[PDB]
Amino acid sequence: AFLLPDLIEIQRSSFRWFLEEGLIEELNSFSPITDYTGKLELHFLGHNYKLKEPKYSVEEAKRRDSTYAVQMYVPTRLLNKETGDIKEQEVFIGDLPLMTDRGTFIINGAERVIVNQIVRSPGVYYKSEIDKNGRRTYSASLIPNRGAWLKFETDRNDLVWVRIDKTRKLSAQVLLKALGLSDNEIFDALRHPEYFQKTIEKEGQFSEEEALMELYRKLRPGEPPTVLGGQQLLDSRFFDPKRYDLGRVGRYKLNKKLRLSVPDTVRVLTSGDILAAVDYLINLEYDIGSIDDIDHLGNRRVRSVGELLQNQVRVGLNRLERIIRERMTVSDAEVLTPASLVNPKPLVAAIKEFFGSSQLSQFMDQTNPLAELTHKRRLSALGPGGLTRERAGFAVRDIHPSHYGRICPIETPEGPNAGLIGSLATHARVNQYGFLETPFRPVENGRVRFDQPAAYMTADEEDDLRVAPGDIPVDENGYIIGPQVPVRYRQEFSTTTPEQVDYVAVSPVQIVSVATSMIPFLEHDDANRALMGSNMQRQAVPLLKPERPLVGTGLEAQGARDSGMVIVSRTDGDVVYVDATEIRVRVSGQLPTASGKSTDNGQLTSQKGQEIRYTVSKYQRSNQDTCLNQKPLVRIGERVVAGQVLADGSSTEGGELALGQNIVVAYMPWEGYNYEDAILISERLVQDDIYTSIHIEKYEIEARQTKLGPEEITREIPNVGEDALRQLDEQGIIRIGAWVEAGDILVGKVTPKGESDQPPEEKLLRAIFGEKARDVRDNSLRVPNGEKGRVVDVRLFTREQGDELPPGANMVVRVYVAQKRKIQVGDKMAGRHGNKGIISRILPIEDMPYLPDGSPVDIVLNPLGVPSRMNVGQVFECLLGWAGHTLGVRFKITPFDEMYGEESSRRIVHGKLQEARDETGKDWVYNPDDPGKIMVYDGRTGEAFDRPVTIGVAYMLKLVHLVDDKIHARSTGPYSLVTQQPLGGKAQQGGQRFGEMEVWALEAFGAAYTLQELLTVKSDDMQGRNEALNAIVKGKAIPRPGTPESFKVLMRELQSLGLDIAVHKVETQADGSSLDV
C-alpha cells in the first residue's frame, strides 16, 4: 500500500547531512587564526573545500584489511593582517573512511557501524519537587546540548540560589552578577518575584557582587575577589562560545518554549531569557506554568553520527587550536606557511577514534540480513553523554506513550543493559533537531481516505487532538464507523467519534523495529509473550539454501533490499548472459545495457553499450563468521526496471526474508524425547539437505623475529609426517581448496628455544639415545580438532607490500576454512515469536508419525507448548500454511485481523481450508468434525493415535548457539599467571567454570574430600595437581591436599599491606611460627 520510505538511510543523509553542512559550519565559525600578536593570521578557508578520489573502495579496502577513506583537504585564506600576505594554498586536514554500501564505514579491518543515542536534548528545566512532609518546593535548572548546568530552587520561601558545576553553595546573587540594572527584575519579573519584593535574607547588592560574588565570595576561594575576577569568570562559564553552547536547536527549543523572541542565530545565551526562567519557575511556583517533562523526547532526543562525528571534530580541532596557537606563534612567521604549521595528525587520529574506538562502534553484527536491519537502528542512551547503566534507575526504563508510534516496545535485550534500545519507529523519520516523525493521518470529522493533508508529523509529540489509534472499522471511504471510538488525547485515550479526532494509523503498525513485524498474526499473541522470540529471527542464522517463508505478512521484502545482501539495478537492464560470476549490464555489450541506458543518464556512462559493472559475493567470513553468497537470480534477457532487486542474496529468493522453511508440525507428546522445550525432528531434515549452516573463521598466525634470535615459519621440522607435511606448500604453507579434519596442520612456524642450561638428562640423552638433534622449534599451526573443513582461501603477505604489519612481527599468516555443516542436537532452533528450542534426537524417517494421505510428518512439538506460552496463533500459521502447502497459497498480508474488526482470521482459516480441502480431491486433509484438527493414525507401529490431533506447517528457524562454538570441556592445562590457576575465558582449555554458589551447596553434605581436593588440586597445588597426575598413572593413592597457596599469595600481599601471622603448630615448643611462607 503506501510506501514506507527506506528505513535505512536515516543515517545516510543525516549522515550526509553533516558534510553537506558541517565541515565548515563549525570550523569556519572558529574560522580565523593568527599569531598571538594578531598580525600573521591564518584561516580554515571555510569555503570551496576539496578532497581527491581515494581509490580504495570497500572490498579493495578490506583487501589490505585497512580503513576506507577520503584524504581530506582545505586551503587557508591567508597570512596576515600584517601586510596582507596571502600565501594561500590548500592544506591537507583530516583523511578517514565513511558510510559504505552495506551501511558501514569499513574502517581498518572491518565495517563496524555506529548506534544512535538518546539524550536530554538541551534546555533548561525544572523540578517540581517534593519533600519529607508534603509541603512542596520549586526549582530550576539549565543545560545546553553541551556545557554546564544552570540550576535553581526554592528554600520554602520564594527564595533562590544558583548552583552550577559547584554543588557546594546555597549561593543566590540572581541579577547580582549580570545585568545589574536598577531594579531590572521588577521590569522582567514584575509578578511576585520573591513575594514581589525580595526577602529578608536576600539583599541583591551588586556593586561588588556582579562578576565578584558567589564567584570568590565563597566560590573558588582564596585570592582576593578582583571585579575582573569574576568577570572573566563568568564569561568563562558562559559568554565564550567555545566553552559553551546551546546548540542551535538548543535555542530553537529553548526559546520556543519559553517562546521568548530570541531567534537571533546565536548558539549562546542572553540575560533576559534567564530571567524568563526565573520567573518561569516562580510562575510554576505560583502554579501558572506546568512542570517540565523529564523522561522521554519531551527532554530526551536522538542523535547520531553527524553530531557524534561533529562534536568531537570541533573538540579534536579545539585541541589543535591550542597547539597551533602556539605553533603558529612559536617564533618567526614570515614565510612559515599554512602548509608548515599544520599538524593534521591529531585530528585524523582522534576521529580515527570516533569511528574506530569510541565504545560506540559495534562490530556491525551481520549474523543475519535482518539483523543489520535492526542494527541499523537501535539506539540507546548508553553514551558518553548517556547514563550509567545502573544509576539510570527506573523511568528511564519505562515506557512512555510518546514511545507509542515513536519506538517499539517488543524491542528489549531483557539484559542489565536492556530498556535502553530505542526501537526507532518502524516508520519514523527525524528532523535537524533530531526529533523523530510518526505520521498522524487526518480524518475530517468522519472522512479520512488519506485525501486530507498533514498525516505526516506528530514529530516526537502530538497535537492535543484526542487521537485515532491505528486501526478501527474504517468503512469504505473512511467513514469511520465506530459509533463512539476510542482514540488518544495526550498519553490518555478517551472515546469520541468523527468530530474531534483526526489522526490515526498510517497503518496498523507504527510501533515495531525490523524483527517485531515478523510475527504474522501477533494480533493474536500476548505482548509479554512477544519479545525474545521476536528478537530470535533478529539474529537468526542464515541457511545455505534459502527459502521464503511460507506464510504471509509480508512486509519485508523491501526491507531485505534495504539490507543490501540482495542487489537491485543500480540502474536498469535486460540481462545478457547473467553468468553466475558476472551478471551484466556490466560491460555487457547488451541490453542489461540498454535499459542500462533506458532513458539514459550521464555521470552514469550510458555513453556506450551500457556499462554497470559490479562483482557478486561468494561465502565471506561475516564480522560474526556468518556467511552468504547471494545468487545470480534474474535469468538472461529478462527485462528490468530501475532499482529493483535482481540479486538473490542471503535470505530471499526474491526480496523477501529467507528465514526458515516450511514444515508439517503435528504437536504430539510421543514417547517423550521432548517435554517442554524439547525438540524432536526426523532424520529427513538431514537428507532434506536443508538446515545446513556453513561457517568460515579466521585462524591466523604470525611469526615474530625474536630479539631472542629471529625465527620463521618452516616448511617442516620434525616428527612431521609428510603425512603431515604434505598438503603443505612452499614455505611450510598450507595448500588452499584442501580438505582438513581435526588436529590438522596449518603451516610451519619455526621457533627459537636453545638448551644453554641443558636439562639434566639433556646433553647426554640426546647424545645417549644416540642422536644429536637441535631445538630449532616449531609451534606451527595445528587447526583445532573436528576441523573437517575444506580450506577456502587465504589472504597472506610478508615484508614486501610493506607488511602492514603489527610491527615487531614478520609476516601474516591468516587463512581459514568453513564447512557445510547440517544442524544437530541442542540446536537453539525455534520460531520468531516467543520461542527457544532444542532437540533431542532425530529419527528414522519412517517411525515418525505420518498421514492418511500417506506422508510422514516431520516435526513433533510438544502439544502443551503454545497454550502455556500464550502465544496461540502458532496454530494459526500452522494452519494457514497448511493451506499454503496443500494449494501453494501465498499471503504476505500485514498482521492484526482488522477486516470487519473481529476473529476474521478464523474466518480466513477455515476458509482457505475449506476450498483447499474441497478442491484437494481426497478432501481428508480437513474434517467437518475436525474443524482444525486432523486424525493421527500413526502410533509406534502406526496405530491410530487417538484423538484427531492438529498438525500443519510452521516456520522452524534455527539459531547459532551451535554446540560446536558452544561446546565445551577440557582436562587442566595452563593455569593462570597470577593465581596461576587455569582460566576459563570459554576457550578449548576453558576453565570448567566454577560456582561457589555450589561451594555454598557442596558442604550441605560436606565430607570435605571433594572439596578438599576440590579446591586444591585443582587449584593451588602444583605438586598436588601433578601429584595426582601421577597417583593414578602411578597406581598411588592420591594423597592429601597440598596446602593451598593462593592462600599464601593472598597472605603475602596482606603481610605487606601490614599483616603478620605466626601461623604455626602449637603442640610445638610454646607454639611458634611454622614457616608457611
Binding site: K81, E82, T83, G84
Partner: protein
C-alpha cells in the same frame, strides 16, 4: 484548601471562552452579540514619544514588530568615508578637510552608551619623533582628574616640551 456551599455540584454554564491575546484590550464589552470575527479585541495600539520610523521588519510577519524610532538624529554632512581591510581588517575612516580624517572608533554602527566617537582623527600637531619634556606653558585644563582621557583641552597656544631619551633599566653598577 476548600469546601462547597453545604452540598452541591459543579455546573459549567458552558459558553464561548475567549483567549484574547495579552496586551490587547478585548473589544466586545458586556452583553453584546458578536461572532466568528466581526471586530472584537484590540490593543488599538498606541505609543508615545520616540521619533522617526524607517519601518520595522515583517516581510512574512503580521508584526514581527520592531518599531524604530531611530533617534540620535544628528544630521551630519561632511564626514567623508574611506577604507582599509588588508593588513588590519576593515573600515570606513572618516575623511573631510574639516579636520575629519578619522577611522571608525565605534564600528560602522555598533551600538554603545559612551566613549562615543566615530572614528579617530589624525592631528599631527603635538606629535614628535623624540621623547619629551612636558614643562608646557599655557595650555589649560584645570587638573580635573581627566587631564587624562576624559581630556579637556581648552586653552594653550603653547606646548613647552623637551623631548628626550629615557631607559628605566635598573641594572648592576659599571655595566659598560
Amino acid at each position: 484548601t476548600t469546601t462547597a456551599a453545604r452540598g452541591g455540584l459543579i455546573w459549567i454554564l458552558s459558553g464561548e471562552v475567549y483567549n484574547l491575546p495579552p496586551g490587547a484590550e478585548l473589544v466586545v464589552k458586556n452583553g453584546d452579540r458578536v461572532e466568528t470575527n466581526g471586530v472584537l479585541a484590540e490593543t488599538k495600539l498606541t505609543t508615545i514619544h520616540g521619533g522617526v520610523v524607517r519601518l520595522p521588519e515583517a516581510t512574512p510577519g503580521k508584526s514581527t514588530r520592531e518599531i524604530e524610532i531611530i533617534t540620535a538624529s544628528v544630521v551630519l554632512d561632511q564626514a567623508t568615508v574611506t577604507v582599509q581591510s588588508s593588513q588590519g581588517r576593515n573600515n570606513y575612516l572618516i575623511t573631510t578637510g574639516n579636520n575629519q580624517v578619522f577611522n571608525l572608533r565605534a564600528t560602522p554602527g555598533t551600538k554603545v552608551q559612551n566613549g562615543q566617537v566615530v572614528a579617530e582623527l589624525i592631528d599631527d600637531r603635538y606629535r614628535t619623533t623624540t621623547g619629551g619634556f612636558l614643562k608646557f606653558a599655557g595650555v589649560e585644563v584645570q587638573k580635573k582628574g581627566k587631564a587624562k582621557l576624559g581630556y579637556e583641552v581648552v586653552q594653550g597656544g603653547t606646548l613647552l616640551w623637551i623631548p628626550e631619551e629615557t631607559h628605566e633599566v635598573n641594572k648592576d653598577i659599571s655595566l659598560l
